Symmetry: D2
């Protein structure tokens, strides 16, 4: 029988004997995702082109998530890609939770109408101190909930908590996220590798050899296919649904990768581990990295466990 995100999250809160504060936070996030979706699909674009005779989506998306998270009364510290410093919620609206998000991921793909998305990770504040930026410098092991919305051919919200990974399709006729994939697990091994090979000149030798194994298998088998949308949400989601591997490794220029630990790599690493996949920087599990800067980058290699393991094997040889 049918299940909605609103009802699924409410029942989970009841099972967990929560006070309803994280439930209100998720409710507010789901609302914001729906309004971002509506804007990404360009509803109302006709009023921008004179049909009756204004703000970039990056900014609007951030404002939507910021205001909805603030007005939830569930959050104290908010970290966003769009903000230099962490936002400390005024004390009247303060709750226990720390949220790191990317309100619109995939900026290079906005103008060509390729898939984009929203990423989020949720922490419970651990300090006794006044809430500050330091409450967001937790390792991803500490995540309480994380996931993303994909604004692709359809809009899907993927939500991961300790109970597992669940996928919800947004039905736009009724503005309702519908549970369509329950307790999702990733394939043990896939057949697609995903990275920007235009950086090949700057590749670490382990990355160079790994990719070469994908195109010219030593085990006679057939070569992997290649995909790279250029939007982390789209590429990571395909990895979940299809299996395979995704890599934004440290290249000569970016010696710590490009993607941001708090609101891109950690949320995706958490979805992956909860789905029976893996997420490594090469040196360690992504969720084991202890950050020191809220905007700090990390290298990320993630996906099916047989694939990540094969990469790590190559990486160990080279180190």
């Amino acid at each position: 029988d049918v299940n909605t995100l609103t009802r699924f999250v409410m029942e989970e809160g009841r099972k967990a004997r929560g006070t309803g504060e994280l439930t209100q936070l998720l409710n507010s996030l789901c609302t914001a995702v729906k309004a971002i979706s509506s804007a990404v699909r360009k509803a109302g674009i006709a009023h921008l082109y004179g049909i009756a005779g204004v703000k970039k989506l990056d900014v609007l998306s951030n404002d939507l998530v910021m205001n909805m998270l603030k007005s939830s009364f569930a959050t104290c510290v908010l970290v966003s890609e769009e903000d230099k410093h962490a936002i400390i919620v005024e004390p009247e609206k303060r709750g226990k939770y720390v949220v790191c998000f990317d309100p619109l991921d995939g900026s290079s793909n906005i103008d060509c109408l390729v898939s984009v998305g929203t990423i989020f990770g949720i922490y419970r504040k651990k300090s006794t101190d006044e809430p500050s930026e330091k409450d967001a410098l937790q390792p991803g092991r500490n995540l309480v909930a994380a996931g993303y919305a994909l604004y692709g051919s359809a809009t899907m919200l993927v939500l991961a908590m300790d109970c597992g990974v669940n996928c919800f399709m947004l039905d736009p006729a009724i503005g309702e996220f519908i549970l369509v994939d329950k307790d999702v697990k990733i394939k043990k091994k896939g057949k697609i590798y995903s990275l920007n090979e235009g950086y090949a000149k700057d590749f670490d030798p382990a990355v160079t050899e790994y990719i070469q194994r994908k195109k010219f298998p030593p085990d006679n088998s057939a070569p992997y296919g290649a995909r790279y949308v250029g939007s982390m949400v789209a590429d990571v989601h395909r990895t979940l649904v299809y299996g395979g591997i995704f890599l934004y490794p440290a290249n000569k220029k970016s010696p710590n990768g490009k993607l941001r630990l708090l609101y891109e790599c950690n949320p995706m690493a958490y979805v992956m581990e909860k789905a029976g996949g893996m997420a490594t920087t090469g040196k360690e599990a992504v969720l084991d990295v202890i950050p020191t800067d809220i905007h700090q980058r990390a290298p990320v290699i993630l996906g099916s466990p047989d694939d990540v393991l094969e990469f790590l094997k190559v990486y160990e040889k080279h180190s």
Copy 2:
């Protein structure tokens, strides 16, 4: 001054001194595209999941186009990816046009929600009385119009005719395509290359060398960036919008290429040429291939003229 697709096409038809039959065909196709977009964005999916207590998308898309074109009274021969032979329109609903289309391109990977699209090409028939599939076996240079709808982060219709290429954004709030880019032209030279490098082991020596020049430039310029969504409409539309080059060349599993000439390669070659770009098979312009089978494949290299020229210099070396 605001303009819609319905009004734009109608005025261009008045300037053309058309009898209205092609305009009626194009209205019908755009209605179909709006209904494909709705299904693709998963409107009503809550009913499939039991909200009140099943046709595949590409089958439903085909039915939408087939029915809207037949009932336009403008067509006589219809070629689709999903039908073995050409559909001859029943006599009472016959007009003069031939339409070759892919109703849902990239549809095999719809399961991961990556962008998807509809591609179409329109010809005037050559036959005089009974139409046949011979009316579809024309070279792309005979196209009267061609285009595509992209179901991406937003839905956009790109329409090309002799007058040039125009882009329309679907405003879902009112179901109108809004003219947002008129008389579009690709940039002379781009910075993105797009192909499935997973087939590298099977590349012709010309493709191997060209891709090598993009990753390790001879003149030590910046290497190109790589993008491969895996859906032709998405990869081609980005090529139109951002410039660069898109390749689906011959490999082992596909020695004449994989993409279909009539309703994948030819309509995109036409869009590209009308925007000042190029589309080649390597040996000849795509639009000059004379087809002998409605489902025949063709290699395709397309995009910015400087990039396609640079590929063709490498190709002529290996003749």
Copy 3:
């Protein structure tokens, strides 16, 4: 065969051998109506209530019809209830048609969410001097097309021409008006009467007597049911679809009624007659009044011919 409003107007124009100007006018009206429908249904209301941390509907509606008609290149004079003088279209955008319209009928009614609508009538300019207000002072008999959009439980457009009356339902999933009632004809006699009985103290004695025959039928048949939405478009649409009588009659406090001749009475009077109905002031056919003010009022009694004739019999008796 499925038919859309666009395709139906377009084929009607080709059958009438029109040059495309009227078709372009109606296309523009269609687009404006879908945009009004969207604002009436409160799309985007969440932004006015600060979800991301402003025209009134009658004003927005007027701007939409005004802008879409001007940019149609099909009109020279535009009369609106929201503007004191006729609007003269700038010479570069001038067509040959005169449009009188009420952009959002049902004022008493917006705040309580009851049905509202748009009424329009279209004349061809008869004079050969430069477009002026006098070009709109034509009797309804000269109408080339008229009709209305109803924003009710669903949105529907009713379009009347010489060919007859047709009804189109707006499907909001795809933003297409769908032909659902062709060549509509009104019942010869209804069972509903529609007027504001709160004015009973001021009624013309004929209206008093006529309403008494509907509550106390002298043949001892069933009394009529009463319905008075208070929104002309809703009450007259129901009159059209169910049969019956709608009255906004002259009393002595308002010897010309309340409703406006040019953009309320004449359009519904024309829709009625083309459906086999009637529409009278009590003294003459509404469509036969020669207006002298673009805002002059007219009494109306309209609906099923048996009912209207029943009323005129009572009216003649009081003379």
Copy 4:
């Protein structure tokens, strides 16, 4: 700050320190209302008219409320205009609440696109017996919550509880009910009376005299205006919003009134009293009537307190 129905209801639930069962109940109802709204506005009607080559709205709406309420796990007994006997939820899905509802109200107005609605009343099961139709025969006084959805020019949900009455506007761009009117109170005295005067021949003398005081005021102030949409939800909501009085008194076809006590009269009476208005049968307060039949009928007079009292004075004089 912006507030949604999902967030308001959850916050009121946390305050009352509920277990979340009632909150799940209202969530499911909210989702059903949205899906009914989408069907009422004829989303997807194009597919019913053959765009690609079914129930009455009554049945579908019932199936939507019925299935959503069952799957909430919050209910044990369900009573609906569309079902002869009370439905007893299977024990695995049983909660403690009893819900009586009209899933689509205003049946005579469906076909002419006039406003229609949904009405609901929520009781807690008092008896500790096996759940039965008996558990629904409580007087309105015992109502935990009630309200209605109006599918008018826009869709609005009106929800009443001990805490008061609140109004939520459906934003269809995002499928979210947005709090727009808080703690609503009706005017002390209105200027509109609402009833079907078609039954004038059957009215009792109290009703006849009250209506005569509204058309011919003894104090010689201005007569009230008349409005009768013919859908109870629409007329009752205009009564809440503008003030005045709504009447469905006994007539010859309906000697105990037409409107039904459990799922029409009691919810609207409850909303009225929580807003500072009144609702009587003429003999008692609606909320005081102890029902013996789940489909039993009652006459009803409701609106601004002064108007209901002025009618009651007339009713008292006629004794």
